[PDB]
Amino acid sequence: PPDLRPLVPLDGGRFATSDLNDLYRRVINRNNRLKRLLDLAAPDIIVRNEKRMLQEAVDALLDNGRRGRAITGSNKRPLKSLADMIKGKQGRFRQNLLGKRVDYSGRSVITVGPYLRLHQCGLPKKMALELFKPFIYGKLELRGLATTIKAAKKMVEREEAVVWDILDEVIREHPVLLNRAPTLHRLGIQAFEPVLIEGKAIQLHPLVCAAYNADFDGDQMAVHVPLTLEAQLEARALMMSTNN
Amino acid sequence: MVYSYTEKKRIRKDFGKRPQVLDVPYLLSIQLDSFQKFIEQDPEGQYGLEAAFRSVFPIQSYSGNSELQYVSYRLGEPVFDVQECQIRGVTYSAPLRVKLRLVIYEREAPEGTVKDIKEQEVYMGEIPLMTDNGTFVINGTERVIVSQLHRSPGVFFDSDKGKTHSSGKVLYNARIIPYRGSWLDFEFDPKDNLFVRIDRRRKLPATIILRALNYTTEQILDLFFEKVIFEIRDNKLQMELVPERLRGETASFDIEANGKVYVEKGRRITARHIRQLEKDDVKLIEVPVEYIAGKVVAKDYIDESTGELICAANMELSLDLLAKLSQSGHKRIETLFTNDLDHGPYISETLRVDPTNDRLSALVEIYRMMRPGEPPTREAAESLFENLFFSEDRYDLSAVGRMKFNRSLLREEIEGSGILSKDDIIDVMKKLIDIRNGKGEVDDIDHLGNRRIRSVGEMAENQFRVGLVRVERAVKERLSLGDLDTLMPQDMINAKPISAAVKEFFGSSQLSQFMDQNNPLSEITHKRRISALGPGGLTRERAGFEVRDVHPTHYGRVCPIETPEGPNIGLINSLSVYAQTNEYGFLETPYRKVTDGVVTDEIHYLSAIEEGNYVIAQANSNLDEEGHFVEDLVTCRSKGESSLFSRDQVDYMDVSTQQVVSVGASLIPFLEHDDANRALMGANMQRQAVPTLRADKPLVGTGMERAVAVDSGVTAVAKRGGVVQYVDASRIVIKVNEDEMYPGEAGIDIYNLTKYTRSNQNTCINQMPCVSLGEPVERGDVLADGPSTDLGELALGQNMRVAFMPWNGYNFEDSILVSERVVQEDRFTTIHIQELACVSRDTKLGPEEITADIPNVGEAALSKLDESGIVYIGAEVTGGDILVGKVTPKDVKDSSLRVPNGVSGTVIDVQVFTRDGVEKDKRALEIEEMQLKQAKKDLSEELQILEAGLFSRIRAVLVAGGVEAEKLDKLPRDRWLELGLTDEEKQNQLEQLAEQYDELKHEFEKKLEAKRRKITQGDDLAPGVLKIVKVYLAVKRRIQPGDKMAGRHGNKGVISKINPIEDMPYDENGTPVDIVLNPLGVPSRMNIGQILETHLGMAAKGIGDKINAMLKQQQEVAKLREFIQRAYDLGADVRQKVDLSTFSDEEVMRLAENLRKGMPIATPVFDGAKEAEIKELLKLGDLPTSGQIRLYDGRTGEQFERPVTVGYMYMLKLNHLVDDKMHARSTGSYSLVTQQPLGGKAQFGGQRFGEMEVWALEAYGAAYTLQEMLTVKSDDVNGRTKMYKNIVDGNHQMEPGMPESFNVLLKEIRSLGINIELEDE
Amino acid sequence: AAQIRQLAGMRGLMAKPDGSIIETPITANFREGLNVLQYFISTHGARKGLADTALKTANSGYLTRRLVDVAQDLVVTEDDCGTHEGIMMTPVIEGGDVKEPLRDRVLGRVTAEDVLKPGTADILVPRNTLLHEQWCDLLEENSVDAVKVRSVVSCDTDFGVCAHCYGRDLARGHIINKGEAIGVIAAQSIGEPGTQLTMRTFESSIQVKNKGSIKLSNVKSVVNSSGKLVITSRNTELKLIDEFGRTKESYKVPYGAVLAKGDGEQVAGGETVANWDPHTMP
Amino acid sequence: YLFVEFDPEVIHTTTINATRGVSHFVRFGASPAIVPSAVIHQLSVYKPKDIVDPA
Amino acid sequence: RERMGHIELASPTAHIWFLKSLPSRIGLLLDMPLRDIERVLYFESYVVI
DNA sequence: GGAAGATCGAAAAAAGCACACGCTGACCCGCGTGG
DNA sequence: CCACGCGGGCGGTAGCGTGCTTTTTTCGATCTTCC
RNA sequence: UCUAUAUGUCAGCGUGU
Ligand SMILES: [Mg+2]
Ligand SMILES: [Zn+2]
């Protein structure tokens, strides 16, 4: 289908073309040439060469480089065939099925909060406001300070005091998942209760650092928001730092 | 040694003791001189463009009737200056013009005498010129061509250490690697065979090559073997006995010479037996008949009676064969001498293996080997073999390659032809045979004598030669095809291939890299960098490990400390301070020659190969007067190892202790007290520091800051001595001295400082003047300090009062606690400049243009916009504001450029580029007006100087003539020329001076017109776009928790809390500390240099405090002079000598003014101050000698139980800001194909939940969380909408749905021809 | 100890990149000033370690990914198969050193059959009781060396394993609950210390250090002319057993090894019992 | 497509392969294909009247 | 995003996945060496039916 | 005494090479043909 | 000098490549074992 | 969330590991 091989606009008046489109065009051109040659009652050698070249084009489209030499693009490199986007580290299986990018997620450096408890972690106010935007919208709609989603968006972007009170109220007992980039074992991601702090750095408990194998020398950690009741209970009862 | 004015401003105290015999060379020399060899005119054609032209030209045609030849080349005047190219986005380049002569021969005359000559000049593209600061300007951006460390051409012998054959046997290979051609290999087949391999294809026997070289079997056996003569005597066919052939073997038969039984049958021959045989002078010895069959006949023998070959060459003899030979009547035979270990029969076995028996068969086999699938033709095979290695065009060995080839083969001469020869191949094969036999040693790959450095010039020459041969092919085709009547040399050749290859090399090559402009140290390190990776080099994935290690030959050539950490470790290196490249490209280092036990001052540059032969002593060797070693046994490096040697055995000595380390490592004080890992990390981390609001000189330095600052182009260095006529924040005009004035020159030099210009890393580059009005200057003295530069000294960070103590856990692992006073003083505040571009391009619907009126915008939104449609200069802009108002026709939809969300700042510069032929907006007209005003002022300075001089001359002439000075004073200045004098020589010279005046005025007018034309020239843009608007925003970034801050000893951390000033610990005097550091990281990391630096900084600050106290009391100059003299004279036989008695009593006040903050101290890398000197310096001030004082808790106020280490430390702010790393996303854009959230902070993407996170979630047993993270949050579009609606409503429930990625995968597999679907049942 | 030794004492001998030890060590302290030669010598080891650390991560990640895949389909799905088969477990004994005792290996696991007290033929522990700390203490009080335990490899459950065979959850005191994915946990546990490992490629008689009885296993020996015993087997094992009856030391004697003392004879520390010639085989 | 009649002895195949304007020999397997003389004769008598896609 | 197309090839073409992925499925089914399959597929040698 | 299977070392082909994040540039057919 | 529309390895009257490890498949050469 | 802002790869790097 065309959408799976889109023709993205180049923003400069041109069109960026995928390798699959080039392979399909080559196959279609070869098929049309072979059809014309067959309809022209061509002799044996010419039609054999045309059929062989069509076979080579089909094999290149199905799996470039599997047999013979790969088809080179306009920038002197092998093209990406149908089999190339399935296998490998950049293939569909290992890039969009086993793992994928998620919403309601953030990333920031980690500092040390000596005053935090084992089940608590510091979170920036702006970062928490960005992460829990739909919850704030819902709470504002329920309370009655806003009548439409546009009004809630305007109130959130205006950063009113009522917005901050709602942000304080929503995450009173809403755990968040803190994870480090190298997740060697299950302890690399743990659930913590957020506490609003001033700044842009996540405050981490000193005791859990040995579990995270993290040092305060520029480390960056990601945070995810469990946005359903079952995930909230799972984080509270299984992945909480107190249970580990 | 009388210090310069900039040095007299602030003299750094030097604690070094080793005298300096060689000053530090120019850091950016390797980049410069090499490029000079690429562009300088060379009468001898071996370097650069002249060499390439001589290699390619002259070019003939298919028929001998026309010829194109090259005469000379000239580089043109670049269209725009470096600053103009940088601001306009064009590439700084110079036109290349070449003299080409086309000679049409006389075809009618058989002798081919010249018939017609046509000489012309042809333009062959633009060659990108290289700036004085060792960098290139490509497309308006700064790029650096780093050097490449690659294997030198020549022959190399290696062997696998038993990896293959699965029994530990070593296989030997010999590779001939040319600069340009086909690589050759000779490998040992485990069955003891020789195999020749070309271009790493299938192996072939080497005897095939030998036969292809017109060598018969007899000649090969003569060359590769020794002959034993078996001559039939009157009886028992005694043979010419050679005792050396009897070593290491047992004689099965009794030998009989003269009647003495030296060796009997069945006893092993000992060395005593060999000696007895030698003493007996035995020449002939009896041989049994059966022993003959074991040997192999060497030369073919034919029977005269039957006219047939008795035997061919090289097969095992037989009893029937020897009987037939005896009946034939041949008295003597020749056999090949073989041995188990001394002389292996590898050549004979290889000759047996191959099927080829003649030169033609060998050539046919070689052609089939090289070009499979082609008809084997004798002429084609001969041509291919000749061109493979014996053609100058196809095969070429450089001078370095020929020298290495001759040296490896023990050839006396080092100069030879580039093409290969038969003798060279035979010698290589013989050397490989000898190595197999146990004589000789294999070469070392990592040896710096086997690896050479290729600079920008060599690669540029190679690319230009490739383009030149392409152009030569094109011109050959044109000459062959075109007529011989109206051909012009310009039309024959096309400059497109030359320009294309040049721009590809200078912009898209891996070695061509974006120059990092974080600080001058980063630029210096990047320019002085050698990368093994690149074309014709190692790959990062397959680089291996054994190459990454530090070879012993790296001493004084490659710094082991300064290497990148990560995947490319050991593959990228930093050149040493004194390292330089030889004429062949091999790295060499200076040394001091030692003669008769005394260390002379003569300096000899030794390479890796030459260093091994001699014995070199280490730099840290005690030396008394007359350069005599005070110790009988001195540690020295002889051959890849260090050992004790006698004083007379030494031959060379290291020039200085900084030879080993590079500039980055040499800039780290107390390196010898620091761990190697921490030193490496600190050296790599010093390059990432960002310039601060104010540059603070390092209290503890190494004395190399001045060299780095001067060598780098960030600072302004006076070209000629003189006085500062005019000083300003933007420009400096200096009236040069009369002695340095060129004839017919105004005598003023104008330096235009660069103020607030963005760098490659979005930082701020600003130059501030460092001299005052009327201050005399000299050549080489710094005028304006560049970024991260203080008074000509490198200033990467700031000096902070640090204290090593735990503080309520706020430090912990590596975190840093920072006082509020640091933020209040804006010590670490930085300026970041960001560029935003708006493009106005001609779409098919209608040409878009910048207008102030935008559809559906509020009036307040357009307040910042002017009538032209551009944001006002200096108007503060927050997120979402409109910078440039652009509208695209539909009637018009808004396309105005807006700042990204979360980006603030102040607009500081607006640049408009308009394609020629399009109307110019009034904003561009204003920009041009200010540019022309600045140019007019710059020209008018010189115009006024020259006019004043000329009018003074005419006034003097008129006073001498008619004596009318008073009338001139009363008369207007401009009406002095119109006055008429009496008819004499005075009138004639007055007319001449008037002519000179009007000529000068017209010359200045044409110069101004040329400048205006240059600045008003339309910019060249890409097709389809007619306007570009660039807006620069300046943002002040202040220190805050999460920012990464570090030091020079590898200690790093992040800010944890900006504590109040009252909470900091304070000493008895009440002064609080600024930085609190955890001591726990000192012993484990083994970085003790930071503690010594802290103590030295404390001593320096104590001295500075004493100086400040003296100054505040208005003490007399005598007391300050005495105190500063005592402070400078402190030390233990320091080499630095400072005399204040010759400072005119006025520069002492300036020095004390500069020393009030502190006393800078120079601590060499390995010849630094000892602990005793530090204690003495501390005792000089009113500070304890232990370095630890007693403080009190700021919050509580009781006494600290133990003294803590508090001092002054140079701390750097890294380029890792928390505001640039923090990101958060709830909902946003999604990918078109996979329907997944985007990636990256710039695209407002979401964090990726990788495989490891999924595994951790499964291990935790959480299933609902994993499903929510997998489908609803990322892929399920209906799930996404339902979740958003439910959360807005207030219900936290989720539907599983169907991820789109699985549907895409199923569709792809279906399109692969394989049917896949899900079954409901 | 090593880091303080380097800080306040001389660094000592170092090694070349190949591996050979440099003849001249470093006699300078980190507090003192190392010369150029000593720093250049140390840079070899520093760069070797840095390169090893940089290059180990790829292999560690590949190994942990393969391990995660190979066990991604293993979950607990039953309580007890009823199988009486298991793995025999004894403390690891080799050379003249004991690394892991029986208590450490046996802790947190269930038994395969009724383990009996030695010399009494009385059931020391029941058949299917999980061995916690108290059970381990009781087992070690009776000087028991061999315990048969139920292992995952011996689990009779198909398409999964049972909770009893797996044993303790190792993260909680109680037994492992049903539904826990143990394959992923095991793979992550194995792959986590992968970075701590190293990817580098770096006698004629037996010695007795303790006092106890001597036992010979798989031995058919003969008396020589002088009365000494010489073995006629290639799989002859010697066990030194303490007074309590548990195996303390283990050795594997080679062919043609003379015996200083016979089986069942007490020996003292520092004595040599077996002597042999490794250069040639008589 | 072109049909070139030549002797490889007189001029090598690689020279024709490097001729300007010629893409490559039509080859099956390693060796280049050989066109029989019957095909050449038929082509010399092969005279069709047709149309083309641009036409 | 779901509708697919089809091209009617005038001549059959063998699937590369079932042919080059060792062991070759076509070669195993026909019990003949791979090189003969390559020769007949790319019009190098005829095969009898 | 010739064929069959067999086996054994050697040569050729295929698959893999940790994760996460941030930044920059450099394209994203060229050319004979046509109007 | 403003589109344009199909083969494509590029360019040339040939050659370009060239520093990993492990596993799987097949082949030539022998061998060896017999019916 | 189809409310803004809705591309890809190659090369060079750097950071945490
Ligand atoms: Mg860290
Ligand atoms: Zn079980």
Notes on the structure:
This is part of a larger assembly, with three copies of chain A, one copy of chain B (1321 residues) and one copy of chain D (55 residues). Chain A is 40% helix and 15% strand. Chain A is α/β, with parallel strands linked by helices and 244 residues long. In chain A, helix 1 runs antiparallel to helix 2 (44-62). By secondary structure, chain B is an alpha+beta fold. Chain B has nine domains: 26-152 and 445-575, no CATH class; 153-225 and 344-444, Dna-directed Rna Polymerase Ii 140kd Polypeptide, Chain: B, domain 3; 226-343, no CATH class; 576-656, Roll (Rna Polymerase Beta Subunit, Chain: C, domain 4); 657-713 and 789-828 and 1038-1221, Dna-directed Rna Polymerase Ii 140kd Polypeptide, Chain: B, Domain 6 (Beta Barrel); 714-788, Beta Barrel (OB fold (Dihydrolipoamide Acetyltransferase, E2P)); 829-918 and 1019-1037, OB fold (Dihydrolipoamide Acetyltransferase, E2P) (Beta Barrel); 919-1018, Helix Hairpins (Helix non-globular), CATH 6.10.140.1670; and more. In chain B, strands 25, 26, 27, 28, 29, 30 and 31 form a seven-stranded mixed beta sheet that branches. Chain B has a six-stranded mixed β-barrel with strand order 44-57-45-56-55-60. In chain B, a hairpin with a 5-residue loop joins strand 55 and strand 56 (1052-1059). With 55 residues, chain D is an all-alpha fold. Chain D contains two helices and no strands. The longest helix of chain D is centred in the last third of the chain and has 8 residues, at 37-44. Chains in contact: A-B, A-C, A-D, A-E, B-C, B-D, B-E, D-E. Chains A and B meet through helix 3, strand 1, strand 2, helix 4 and helix 5 of A and strand 56, helix 32, strand 61, strand 62 and helix 33 of B. Strand 1 of chain A pairs antiparallel with strand 62 of chain B. Magnesium ion binds at residues 215, 217, 219 of chain A. Chain C: One of its GO terms (biological process) is nitrate assimilation. Chain C: Keywords: Acetylation, Antibiotic resistance, DNA-directed RNA polymerase, Magnesium, Metal-binding, Nucleotidyltransferase, Transcription, Transferase, Zinc. Chain C: Zn(2+) 2 binds at residues 81, 155, 162, 165.
